[PDB]
Structure 1
Amino acid sequence: GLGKDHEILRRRIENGAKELWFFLQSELKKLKHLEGNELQRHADEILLDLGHHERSIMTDLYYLSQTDGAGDWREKEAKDLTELVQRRITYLQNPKDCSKARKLVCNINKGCGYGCQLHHVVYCFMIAYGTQRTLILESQNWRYATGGWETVFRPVSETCTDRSGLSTGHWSGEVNDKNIQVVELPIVDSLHPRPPYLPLAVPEDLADRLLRVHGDPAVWWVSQFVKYLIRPQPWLEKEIEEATKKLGFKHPVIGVHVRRTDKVGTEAAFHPIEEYMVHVEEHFQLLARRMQVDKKRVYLATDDPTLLKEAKTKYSNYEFISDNSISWSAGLHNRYTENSLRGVILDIHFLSQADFLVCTFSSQVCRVAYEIMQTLHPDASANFHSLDDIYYFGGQNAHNQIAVYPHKPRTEEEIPMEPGDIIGVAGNHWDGYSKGINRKLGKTGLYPSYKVREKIETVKYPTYPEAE
């Protein structure tokens, strides 16, 4: 039948939202007959009260997601899917005869940072999976560690790591390469023609089961290849375990990635420590409603060695967990060394293990951590707050949404929408509005974020029946 707690919680969520609406209607009407100081003090007081009121609703929603076996079922179903995908990838990557295997050769040496390079391999991997070719990762002279991938990670194959074959060619399309045994894939920006096995689409054979389980199936798919790629060598597995003990990493803990140095004034903006911490504080207030928070722990990953001292001074009621020598190694002068490589691998590891992630998704470092985080819980798709971009995968196809409720523009900055219009989302402004193009009309501008739904794209991937 129906669960007692499920029904109490659903009714409490309804009633809490109603009480919030009652409160808002009364307070905004009072507010619009004030001025000067009294107007501003009341505005602030309303926001304070709304914060706690909204967090109690979120708290009941968290409980609703777990009652009456839901949490256990979601865990068992997520575990079952990941074991299936990993089992497929492993079968693909370990043919019996390497001399006769179809192969796709990826070169790690894209000229960029660790996250960008890791995502390059993921993109190679996703296309190899889609074309039923064993991924051959060539990583000699990898600028972080010229010994190659196996400096930190397991080889991507136990049986087939050789690039030999009866015929080799540069990628030219799935059909043309039908009978070519070894195909060389370039970086995505040089890829012509593009195949369908790219983010943010998901395999159509997994799409239905994924909706039952995960809030963002596109990231889940990406993360399955990240999971396989970062299988640690024995020594790295030990380094992570030793770091966990030495740093005192324990829960609850919130991860904060503050990207500075060369990202400032090229691809992203400078963000002061206070802009990250408002969301850290907001989230610990949430956690405190459902668990006791002995100590407010923040794992701080940054390429600015001076930030740790600044944060500690400004937030003395927080315990900042952070490896300042790792920060030093991320500086421009030492970035492309093995010591630095392991610094970022560890920072990304602990970022990914946190209960919540606050950062700028414009940085590949945070995206990797967010991606890995998906492999650690049934549905961690919402456990982040980004100060700029929404989730994206460099080289993805167009991210589209579908308008569900009509919108009449109130200013010229807003675009109109009718239920069913394809909206190409460029970003969420985290203020109730997103920016995108209404492809129906060809107009670009702002629209209310709640009035659209995600347009999840599917692709016919192989399902590797033999892997069972």
Structure 2
Amino acid sequence: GLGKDHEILRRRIENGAKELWFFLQSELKKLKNLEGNELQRHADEFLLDLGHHERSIMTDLYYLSQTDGAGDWREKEAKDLTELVQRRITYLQNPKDCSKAKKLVCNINKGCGYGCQLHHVVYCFMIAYGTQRTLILESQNWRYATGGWETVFRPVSETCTDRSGISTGHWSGEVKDKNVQVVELPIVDSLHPRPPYLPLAVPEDLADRLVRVHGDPAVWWVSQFVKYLIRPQPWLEKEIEEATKKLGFKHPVIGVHVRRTDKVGTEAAFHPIEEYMVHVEEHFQLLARRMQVDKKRVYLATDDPSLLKEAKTKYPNYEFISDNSISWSAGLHNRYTENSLRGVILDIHFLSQADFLVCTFSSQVCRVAYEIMQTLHPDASANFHSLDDIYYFGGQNAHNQIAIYAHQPRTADEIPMEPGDIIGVAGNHWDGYSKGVNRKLGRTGLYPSYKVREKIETVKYPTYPEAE
């Protein structure tokens, strides 16, 4: 059978879309006949009406995702897959005889901040998993905690944290390293040759189940290594519990990460508070169509300790949840300390727990929070708005899309496409256009975002059947 609610909602979406098309073509024909102030006023009233109409269609699509048991099914399937992957990682990480285990050695001390260093460990872990090597994490003299990883997180194994082997060598590829018991992996920036066990590909054995359950299987797969790595020590778990209570952290909330200080001009622009808060307001308008919004609440994470005062002053209708001493702790004077380490971990935790995330994906901090968010919901792939980049994993293989409809360029800034063309995406301008390279032409420019599909890449990974 099909579900009655499913059929009602599908037809309501289709009728809602058709009515939006009738409304668009009528109101745009009217706009053409106006000028100056009447044109401004008409356009503004039109945008307000379109926002409500658009949000009704998105609300119906949310209900369609849940109806007739689909929500319960998605939650059960996502749980089954996480448990499966976590069991395979635990099995890899816990050989019975550490002496005789194949191993991959990772050093945490890359020359960068916490999110960049966590992503380096994820990259090491994913290649460990692909090559059937126990991950050994070397973390003495960590700039955030001289005592290492186990200052905050559980060790990465219970049975095998020792580097002993009959042979050691620097990574030279799976074929040359086949009989080398312990391989040392460099940073992805220096890795040659590259093995296939890198983002944004996903394991061939899971790909059908992942595409069915999740809008971005690449992030979900990265998130399973993040989930395993950041298992907290009991003292940190107690600190998060009591932080939750003391901050009055509560739902609904929108996470906002504002990255300023040394990021600006090197790796990102300065974005004013108003640019984040436009998307927070829009998302609360959407949530209010399907739930009670007690108070509009924002969890603010920032390395600018003057921002919180600014935000409260400009948005007195909003409840801001923030630890301003964490913001202070993140300045360049204090950043590489255990105090600042606990601060970034807490900010990332609360961001990742929010209903929605507004930030710059140019920041490794926001990307870690978005990856953790994937572990907390069946499919949180769409629960963000980036002011700059799309999701990426530094060191990833080429992010390709496939043109599904033809594009004839209207300006020289646009690229042509025919269906089938491989597009290397550089980003989404959040205005209906993306920028990328039509591979076949080597032309870079703009294309309508709706005219491409994501190319899921799969890789033959080990499946660790003895983990069952």
Q: TM-score, normalised to structure 1's length?
A: 1.00
Residues 68-127 of structure 1: CA deviation (Å, up to 9, x unaligned): 000000000000000000000000000000000000000000010000000000000000
Residues 205-233 of structure 1: CA deviation (Å, up to 9, x unaligned): 00000111000000000000000000000
Residues 399-426 of structure 1: CA deviation (Å, up to 9, x unaligned): 0000000111011110000000000000
**Structure 1 residue 48 displacement after superposition:** 1.0
Tell me the SS of whatever aligns to 1:20: helix
Distance, in Å, in 2 between the alignment partners of 1:354 and 1:56 is 23
Residues 359-415 of structure 1: CA deviation (Å, up to 9, x unaligned): 000000000000000000000000000000000000001000000001110111100
**Structure 1 residue 35 displacement after superposition:** 1.1
Distance, in Å, in 1 between the alignment partners of 2:255 and 2:173 is 41
**Structure 1 residue 149 displacement after superposition:** 0.2
Distance, in Å, in 2 between the alignment partners of 1:11 and 1:422 is 34
Residues 408-465 of structure 1: CA deviation (Å, up to 9, x unaligned): 1011110000000000000000000000000122211100000000001000000000
**Structure 1 residue 45 displacement after superposition:** 1.2
Distance, in Å, in 2 between the alignment partners of 1:228 and 1:47 is 45
Distance, in Å, in 1 between the alignment partners of 2:124 and 2:42 is 55
Residues 269-311 of structure 1: CA deviation (Å, up to 9, x unaligned): 0000000000000000000000010111100000000000000
**Equivalence map 1:323-342=2 (5 Å):** 323-342=323-342
Distance, in Å, in 1 between the alignment partners of 2:191 and 2:354 is 36
**Structure 1 residue 2 displacement after superposition:** 1.3
Residues 228-263 of structure 1: CA deviation (Å, up to 9, x unaligned): 000000000000000000011111000000000000
Tell me the SS of whatever aligns to 2:376: coil
Distance, in Å, in 2 between the alignment partners of 1:143 and 1:79 is 35
Q: Match of 1:190?
A: 190
Tell me the SS of whatever aligns to 1:290: coil
Tell me the SS of whatever aligns to 1:401: strand
Distance, in Å, in 2 between the alignment partners of 1:327 and 1:461 is 41
Q: Match of 2:214?
A: 214
Residues 299-353 of structure 1: CA deviation (Å, up to 9, x unaligned): 0000000000000011111000000000000011100000000100000000000
Q: TM-score, normalised to structure 2's length?
A: 1.00
Q: Match of 1:251?
A: 251
Tell me the SS of whatever aligns to 1:5: helix
Paired residue total: 468
Tell me the SS of whatever aligns to 1:292: coil
Tell me the SS of whatever aligns to 1:408: coil
Q: Match of 1:77?
A: 77
Q: Greater CA deviation, 265-274 or 3-12?
A: 3-12
Tell me the SS of whatever aligns to 2:288: helix
Distance, in Å, in 1 between the alignment partners of 2:32 and 2:440 is 38
Tell me the SS of whatever aligns to 1:14: helix
Distance, in Å, in 2 between the alignment partners of 1:316 and 1:64 is 35
Gaps of at least 5 residues in structure 2 are none
What is the aligned-residue identity percentage?
Answer: 97
Distance, in Å, in 2 between the alignment partners of 1:32 and 1:412 is 26
Q: Are residues 1:166 and 2:170 paired?
A: no
Distance, in Å, in 1 between the alignment partners of 2:56 and 2:113 is 41
Tell me the SS of whatever aligns to 1:282: helix
**Structure 1 residue 196 displacement after superposition:** 0.4
Distance, in Å, in 1 between the alignment partners of 2:21 and 2:248 is 43
Q: Are residues 1:136 and 2:139 paired?
A: no
Tell me the SS of whatever aligns to 1:357: strand
Distance, in Å, in 1 between the alignment partners of 2:324 and 2:255 is 15
Gaps of at least 5 residues in structure 1 are none
Q: CA RMSD in A?
A: 0.5
Could you list the structure 1 runs, at least 4 aligned residues long, displaced by more than 3 angstroms after superposition. none
Distance, in Å, in 2 between the alignment partners of 1:45 and 1:222 is 43
**Structure 1 residue 38 displacement after superposition:** 1.1
